[PDB]
Design a protein around this ligand. Structure first.
Ligand SMILES: Nc1nc2c(ncn2[C@@H]2O[C@H](COP(=O)(O)OP(=O)(O)OP(=O)(O)O)[C@@H](O)[C@H]2O)c(=O)[nH]1
Ligand SMILES: Nc1nc2c(ncn2[C@@H]2O[C@H](COP(=O)(O)OP(=O)(O)OP(=O)(O)O)[C@@H](O)[C@H]2O)c(=O)[nH]1
Lengths: 191, 191
């Protein structure tokens, strides 16, 4: 039976430092998770697993720790925050006060100045989902907003539930598509 | 005419780093706001101004720049994050995934493990609201949650919308209560 493993990149510099978006590398702890992930995968004993990542350094560095070939997707790249890229929630409140609240009205269709929205991201992911269906066993090392859209698809969640799906760092969601839908198991790798 | 100048302490080191709670001091930019705030106060030509701060290093440090006396109130201390003290919103999502989700159901009544809620803080702020009410011109250098509770009281906002009120850093809100309720004047101090 096939299964799709979804998880985020290891903790990044910006993650640890309190900032969103950007293209930072893995933190010391992030690298540790990469090795923990490699251990978990090997533990699964999967037949010919294909590893997918985005173009972001964080996803790549995580895959590098798997010692197996990985395919890069520009579509798996994290949502563009635009003007408030690499900013903290406090900086966003200070420099873009009305935008911060505008989001609360509709987090799915909300779009940051010069950036994407969850609705946009869902659309940009269409190609990936298509391929995900054609594959057997796949490990998609991605991002928060991305993992939420992917998860929402397989778990048939509404556009409302989507922006609030649990996609923490160092947690691998193993989806096993079945007749009634798709089973899910949460594996937290503590490092 | 009497005004209640509510403002948050100047940016702290922890604010800049991504973390909630703690007892850190003002960053260099935070200190700059302390000085800007002092300049603003003088320009106001205010009569017998009373400065109130909390016992936190960040509020004291802001008051010092004013060059005027100020009284400290433990009741004005920021809401306790309990076990989540000094964590980032990612660390919370990772180590306390269920807690994070539960909070989203009721931001007002959500209480941190070993900490408090907005409801708890309201009770704690009761005597502050009273003295503040029976006072004249008053400057209160406080924190985010605290400023929200105070503001909601004077603007007669429901507990429902309380946690979402705009309380960005480096912004002083001049509150002048008048017959139909209370008037506000948002003063942004760019530094
Ligand atoms: N308002 C607010 N936004 C935050 C905070 N921390 C991160 N954000 C940003 O708020 C938006 C959505 O928040 P979340 O649903 O928690 O995460 P996300 O949508 O997957 O965002 P990305 O960070 O782009 O993945 C994103 O642009 C986040 O980067 C915070 O404390 N407050
Ligand atoms: N989980 C999470 N908590 C955050 C974030 N930004 C701030 N917090 C903390 O989450 C709680 C509620 O968030 P907010 O309503 O934005 O702010 P607050 O309640 O005034 O927070 P305090 O800073 O504790 O007063 C508080 O304890 C915040 O410190 C974030 O992005 N994620």
């Amino acid at each position: 039976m096939r299964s799709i493993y979804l998880c985020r990149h290891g903790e990044s510099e910006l993650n640890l430092r309190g900032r969103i978006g950007g293209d930072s590398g893995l933190s010391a702890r992030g690298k540790q998770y990469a090795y923990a992930l490699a251990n978990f995968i090997r533990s699964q004993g999967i037949s010919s697993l294909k590893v997918w990542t985005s173009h972001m350094k964080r996803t790549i560095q995580t895959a590098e720790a798997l010692g197996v070939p990985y395919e890069q997707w520009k579509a798996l790249n994290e949502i563009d925050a635009g003007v408030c890229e690499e900013m903290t929630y406090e900086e966003i409140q200070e420099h873009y006060p009305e935008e911060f609240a505008l989001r609360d009205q509709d987090k799915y269709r909300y779009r940051y100045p010069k950036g994407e929205s969850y609705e946009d991201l869902v659309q940009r992911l269409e190609p990936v989902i298509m391929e995900l269906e054609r594959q057997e066993n796949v490990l998609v090392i991605c991002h928060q907003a991305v993992m939420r859209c992917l998860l929402a698809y397989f778990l048939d969640k509404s556009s409302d539930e989507l922006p609030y799906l649990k996609c923490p760092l160092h947690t691998v969601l193993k989806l096993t598509p079945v007749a009634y839908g798709c089973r899910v198991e949460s594996i937290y790798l503590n490092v």
